Ligand binder design. Sequence first.
Ligand code: E3R
Lengths: 290, 57, 218, 232, 338
Amino acid sequence: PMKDYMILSGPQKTAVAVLCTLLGLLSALENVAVLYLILSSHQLRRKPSYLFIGSLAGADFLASVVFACSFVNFHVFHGVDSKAVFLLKIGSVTMTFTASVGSLLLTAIDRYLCLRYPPSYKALLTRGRALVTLGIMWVLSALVSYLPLMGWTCCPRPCSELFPLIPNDYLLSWLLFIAFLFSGIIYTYGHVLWKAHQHVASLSGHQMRLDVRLAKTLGLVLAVLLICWFPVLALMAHSLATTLSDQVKKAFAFCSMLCLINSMVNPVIYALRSGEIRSSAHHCLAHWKK
Amino acid sequence: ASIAQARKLVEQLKMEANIDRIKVSKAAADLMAYCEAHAKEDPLLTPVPASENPFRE
Amino acid sequence: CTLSAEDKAAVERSKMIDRNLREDGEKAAREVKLLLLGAGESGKSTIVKQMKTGIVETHFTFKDLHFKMFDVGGQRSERKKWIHCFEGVTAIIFCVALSDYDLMNRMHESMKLFDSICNNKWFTDTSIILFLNKKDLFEEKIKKSPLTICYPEYAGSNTYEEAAAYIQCQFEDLNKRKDTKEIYTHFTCATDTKNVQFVFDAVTDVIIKNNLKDCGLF
Amino acid sequence: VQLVESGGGLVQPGGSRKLSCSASGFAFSSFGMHWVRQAPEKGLEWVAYISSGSGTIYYADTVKGRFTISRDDPKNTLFLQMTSLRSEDTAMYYCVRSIYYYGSSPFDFWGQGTTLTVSSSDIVMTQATSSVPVTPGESVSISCRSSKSLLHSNGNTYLYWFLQRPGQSPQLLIYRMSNLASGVPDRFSGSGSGTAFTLTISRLEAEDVGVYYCMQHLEYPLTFGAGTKLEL
Amino acid sequence: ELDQLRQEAEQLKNQIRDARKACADATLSQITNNIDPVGRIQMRTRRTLRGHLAKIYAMHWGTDSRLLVSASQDGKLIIWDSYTTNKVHAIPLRSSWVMTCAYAPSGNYVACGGLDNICSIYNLKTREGNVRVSRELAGHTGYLSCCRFLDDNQIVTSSGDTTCALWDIETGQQTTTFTGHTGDVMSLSLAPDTRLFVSGACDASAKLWDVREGMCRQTFTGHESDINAICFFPNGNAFATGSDDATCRLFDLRADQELMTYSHDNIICGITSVSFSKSGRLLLAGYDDFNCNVWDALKADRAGVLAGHDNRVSCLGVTDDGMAVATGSWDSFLKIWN
Ligand SMILES: CC(C)(CCCCCC#N)c1cc(O)c2c(c1)OC(C)(C)[C@@H]1CC[C@@H](CO)C[C@@H]21
């Protein structure tokens, strides 16, 4: 009797079954291509920055093989969808996407200690301290996301309107955690773009490239974190003050395609923009030629 | 100046020229004899067992 | 644990030696190493006095950042046998006199040492900090002797503001590695006192651009 | 290099007393330091040990819980906080330095000691001889037999030979089995068979007179033998 | 007229070349053509000595074949227990820019030198549990490229001032000064009886010196570039150089010529380090291409490859019992290859 959400018929379910198939495998193709290229090069596996790129490409890989499977097993397959294993499946897409959102914050903080403390940066964020804060980020993104099947049913709340079988009062405590992760990314990426303005103005005062070279890269980073994720989180928070309309019933499941659309740009934007990943990419095209 | 420096090179090359040299076939057989007489005592030529080897990974 | 009482205490010594190697390697990784490479004492020692035997290390501090200028002018050996020791230095502080252009030529000897060490194999990515010092003596010579002695292909006049921009551009046109290294040029003298401020600004441009290169952002 | 101890004196039983071992003339922080006590008629007995950097801290089973050993590296001082003192703690407590690496000589320098007076699985090293009459110029073979094979898998035989001259602190002679310590004459020589060990003095002089203790260093607690006195 | 003395020196080194060709009746590769090859040599990384933080520039095994000292450019000089990978000592150096280190055959002293032109002898087996500088040997005007102990009191150093020197350590002065090179002396190797030593310099010539007499006995010219490495054969009657023109050449002392040339076409980069094994059948050469090639020394043929360093192999040495090979590199890792 959960069957109250599949309002996809004809070309709507066609645009979810085939699209998420090609969206899912191609985004999972390059995610394991990045995860191989980090551990293949031992000179890159000792660098504490490509662990946060790896934990991005790790969590985004699992979020592109679990969410792409659970979206096609929900809308065209219509499985058994039990009361208890659903909260395992909606939580395993919520951890693996928050751990890809929180791995952008650990990439942003890592890109802030490049400019806040320049000479002590390699002394501060070591390989030992990288795996520690990767562990705290992975288990904080677990307990905020697996808290559904760890004792949170929608019966003490009334419950949510957009998500099947989840408390509405949890959706105000996960949205305001990703918003803290988002206001932690934008505020970090504001002072990277500010310490690149109190430095290029200072160096050029003796006798404007780094200021633009960051702003074109950190603008395309914050575009795909707001072109993708904000059309998912805006109408998710719209369900509280006003009830839902009919034309936005199917669009939220179509706006949910933007999260794994964000999954196939994150190896392009975070790993392909790196040169040391790309220098080992051209190195390995003669490695498996045999 | 270099009158004694060119004399120092002549005096060096004169004591290097008047040494005695054996044939190369005699010097090569005496190197070949050393690598066969001590071949059993070479732990990289002949790989030792893992008991007598002090490196066990 | 299969170790004896003495071998367990030898492991604890080796772990305590390990702890002092990391504490002394973290103290050295926060330090800035600079390789001073002036050409034939072209104001090379007149900016060591402006901050604050084989090689002469000069420690100084500016804004809680410890620098180390390794002057290598007292070697007189083949440079290619020991210049790989300084591979991994943060920057190369190069000192060229602006008043040796008239003095085979003294300024072309500076450009040859510049060309060999900026386009070196080991310094393909360490930024040069060029110091075009003795500019006060360049005022009293460019008004009498033009730049046609050192640079015959020069059509500009004997104004200093275009002559100094030519010697800067003649030195900064010698890097073939423009996609990976940068050249920071300053016009100093003895009376200039903002030169450690320039070195602090030029090497914090190096360490920022090296941290952004190592964090994958560049 | 010298170690000088402070503390000692008459203590009421059940009370507390802190011994202090002021180190001077050597790099104190790179040495593990032991406390070795000697009852006024018995032989040596190991009390406690603190490593370099205070990493490992061991005690004897007699003094576990109520003794506390601690070092203070900036002042080059070693402490032994003793609480709840019994009548079996009346001893002269020596303060021994010992450094551990490959080829090192542990237990090489001993402090002078402070006599503390109170008022009224272990390897067993056995020296069956207790007193040997010797004329100078002769060849002496002090024997020591363990209760366990002191030979380890790495090839080291952790058997230490000390000489406590009358009126002095013990002095290391043979640090591992057959390893002559620095500064002792060549007439001493150690030898053993894994469990039974000998110490051979070739041409004995007047300075070789005293009690000879064999110590194992295979595992903690380090145990001594009731040493063989040599008499003229 | 010194051109007459120039005309006589050019006539006299033709008598060198003619009396060297008068002994070349059969090569080493013709004699060892009818011998069985070494086959393939599989050496595994047994230990990886981690703990340096810069490029390791030299290492040296102790004569007990268990302890090895290494020098890197972080200003440290670590003595390793190679069996159980323990650091025995870490010696902080007054100059970080060291290019050589040596272990005394007694085991009590370790010398090191480098860009400071000073060979500092460090006393390991002191009292006090400390390692202190027992001597500093000044008198070289170029960078100190190699040092080797004759015993506890004598040490031969070479330097970039075209000069090797023999020192007394307690009276820290040059007992003998070996001049005759016309380029930076980059390496030296004592004979097994330590009465002679060869030194290779940047003038593409090796020279055999008498230690007690102080003279240049023989001069060996077969290379085309800077000889970076030299090592004596275990017989003591031959030696192998290694240079920047990617060849190792085996010279002998009695026939006064080169015997083999250890070159391949796949190797273009120079040799940093050369050492024979025990019995002299293997010739281990470290290269700039992150790689150490094991050469069959009696033939020319290449045996196995000691691959597994991420940067240039700067130093290598075989133990005195021939049991292992330790290679240091410009990544901060010493690997031990049994
Ligand atoms: C990636 C994310 C944006 C994560 C948001 C969840 C946060 C916690 C909550 N609440 C997301 C958005 C989704 O719209 C959906 C997701 C995950 O996963 C499955 C299990 C496939 C849903 C099944 C039912 C569909 C609606 O009938 C919606 C599907």
